[PDB]
Amino acid sequence: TDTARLRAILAAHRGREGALLPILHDVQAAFGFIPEDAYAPIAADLGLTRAEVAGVVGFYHDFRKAPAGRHVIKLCRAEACQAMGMDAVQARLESALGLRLGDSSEAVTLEAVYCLGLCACAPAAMVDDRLVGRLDAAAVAGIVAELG
Amino acid sequence: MKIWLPCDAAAKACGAEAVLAALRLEAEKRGGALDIARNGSRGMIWLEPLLEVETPAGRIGFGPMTPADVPALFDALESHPKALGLVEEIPFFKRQTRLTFARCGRIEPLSLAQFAAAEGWAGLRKALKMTPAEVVEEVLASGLRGRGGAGFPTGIKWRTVAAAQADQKYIVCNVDEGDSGSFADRMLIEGDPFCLVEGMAIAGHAVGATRGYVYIRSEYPDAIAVMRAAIAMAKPFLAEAGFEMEVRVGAGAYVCGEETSLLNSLEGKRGTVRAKPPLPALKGLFGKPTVVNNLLSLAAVPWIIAHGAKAYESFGMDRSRGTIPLQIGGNVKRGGLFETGFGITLGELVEDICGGTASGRPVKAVQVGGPLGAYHPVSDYHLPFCYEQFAGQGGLVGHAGLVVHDDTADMLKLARFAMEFCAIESCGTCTPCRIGAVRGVEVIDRIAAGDASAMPLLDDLCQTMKLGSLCALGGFTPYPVQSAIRHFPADFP
Ligand SMILES: NC(=O)C1=CN([C@@H]2O[C@H](COP(=O)(O)OP(=O)(O)OC[C@H]3O[C@@H](n4cnc5c(N)ncnc54)[C@H](O)[C@@H]3O)[C@@H](O)[C@H]2O)C=CC1
Ligand SMILES: Cc1cc2nc3c(=O)[nH]c(=O)nc-3n(C[C@H](O)[C@H](O)[C@H](O)COP(=O)(O)O)c2cc1C
Ligand code: SF4
Ligand code: FES
């Protein structure tokens, strides 16, 4: 059934100019990562080589090589968010979940994003497609509460 | 009574949606009109969940509205604790020239009616009557600038592209502000999207293109959605110009902010920076001539050509002309955005305008530009904003980013984070950013230990990175370091 979805995706991006990125985006959105089982057909459709595809996949960060937990937590580690106390937040959260930075699981996945546009609302995060700001050491409780 | 609850990420983050819920709840419990709008951000983030209510006098703004404070409404708008009065009368707003962001936070972004009533689609409808060359010279007269970098006259670029033969030219907007403190683009494409559509349409009519692209990051999803809706809504207004624009999402790579890497990423390839024997203007996207620009540079185009170049030529300094937005974030009381003419000091912008710090502590550092920018201390408060003086006074002003750090900061940690960034964000094409970075991050540790065979080593490294590196990310990276070291020696043993 995966092949069907993939074919659909490829058909949807037919004739476009430089359609590798969109196609990969969609492939990821579908499954959750770029399986090596799907490096070839992409190439076959686009006239590329498995290698080029894998290289593109490897370069960019937003293309998962392996799936994530049921929940995902991106936590800015940039300048501004650092300024208004991101370290402490990070510590509290990774103590709560027991998962350090970059370390994933079947349950959750904590990672970094390096900005979100919430540079005034300095301590910022993205939890499961929901943005959060002004993350003091209290809101983390609510963050974890809705998130086991 | 009319309600204007922001739809910006700066609002949804702080719980604007919860406020929406609470309002609707109360109205359901307390029979009322309950007329809600979903405008963008005015630019004052310290109270972003602001519930602007209509009155014959104007629009009265409220503070950082929490859902628990909503009950305070529907009873008395005068005796409210978080009552601000006319939002337009706030000194943080009054002192702004505010040209480019003029119609940002006072309209529903996806409302063509309001946009049109807000002088919308004027420049576009004006340009088509003009010629491809007249418009170009109009844009050139102002000599607007490069906003996302050092600053190159866009007019010259347009000219170069126009004077270059091919079946299909291209136009690209590089909204990939992966920088810190830089969030103006987000506000502009989340609120007042149509200006971008307009500017690109104009620029495409001008240059001689039909196909256009816009590069959004993946860390700006709501903005992506908005721009998609915009491009999808303005199809009638777009066909008039013979212009078809598309959005392209990035994939989490800072370096893709560079023009070459950007258009390499558009092409379906991996974002490795190209050397510059040929320029993208000559040979860019798919070997074709392409005009690549920042959002702010394309947001001024319509306003320019419409309201007259000479007017735009009025604001600013001798070299730097026109208004600029100053984004102010980090540890700072009144953050957000401040659009004004150049010549203003960061002294004023950081101590007078934006108060002080959230923690109440003093400021030890102020980082203009992104992490490719220096750490100016308080002593540099006598330093007005402009490309020239800041480039000459050992620094940088690009997207006018501005963060703040108080006395509880460790410059060592930051200087380290700089190289750590240049390390994690790196195409991996040239050696001085591949290795130089991940080595500097060890050198700084050695310094933290106390070694003395490191500082000169560090300096030499910084120097070779400056002079040798291909892009800026490994050429500007040294500035943070050297700045933190020469300005704040009391933290580097
Ligand atoms: N060793 C180092 O430290 C290096 C640092 N940098 C710096 O990075 C900053 C900005 O980065 P970029 O945008 O990559 O370069 P840039 O600022 O030199 O170019 C500005 C924009 O205008 C266009 N342009 C340049 N010359 C043109 C011409 N003759 N005709 C038409 N269009 C032209 C370019 O395509 C680019 O989009 C610059 O100040 C540059 O000095 C860039 C290269 C290496
Ligand atoms: C590492 C790096 C990141 C950049 N990021 C951006 C960006 O987010 N937005 C931008 O407009 N220019 C960015 N630039 C500058 C581009 O090279 C180019 O100058 C700009 O996109 C052209 O827009 P202008 O003509 O309005 O300056 C970046 C450059 C480098 C080296
Ligand atoms: S400095 Fe060199 S290796 Fe590093 S990002 Fe720039 S071009 Fe790539
Ligand atoms: S720096 Fe984390 S929000 Fe932009």
Side-chain angles (χ1 to χ4, degrees), chain A residues 1-10:
Chain A
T1 309
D2 309 336
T3 68
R5 294 183 268 184
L6 183 39
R7 276 207 287 273
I9 291 156
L10 286 146

Side-chain angles (χ1 to χ4, degrees), chain B residues 233-266:
Chain B
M233 271 186 166
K235 164 161 80 209
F237 291 85
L238 269 170
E240 287 181 329
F243 195 73
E244 49 195 346
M245 46 190 297
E246 210 195 348
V247 68
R248 294 294 186 81
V249 188
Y254 188 100
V255 71
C256 297
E258 176 82 351
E259 51 178 353
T260 63
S261 168
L262 159 72
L263 56 84
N264 219 317
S265 166
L266 276 305

Side-chain angles (χ1 to χ4, degrees), chain B residues 283-325:
Chain B
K283 280 183 300 315
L285 208 71
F286 301 124
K288 300 286 143 61
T290 188
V291 66
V292 70
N293 291 121
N294 189 15
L295 163 56
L296 266 49
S297 305
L298 259 63
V301 163
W303 193 99
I304 281 156
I305 62 165
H307 205 289
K310 296 163 291 312
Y312 198 87
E313 198 179 285
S314 169
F315 309 98
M317 304 191 87
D318 182 274
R319 291 287 296 100
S320 318
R321 291 294 189 182
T323 47
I324 195 172

Side-chain angles (χ1 to χ4, degrees), chain B residues 255 271-274 422 425-434 465 468-475:
Chain B
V255 71
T272 49
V273 172
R274 301 170 193 177
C422 189
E425 296 283 354
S426 194
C427 76
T429 286
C430 81
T431 286
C433 164
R434 285 182 57 243
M465 287 169 90
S469 53
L470 182 59
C471 92
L473 177 65

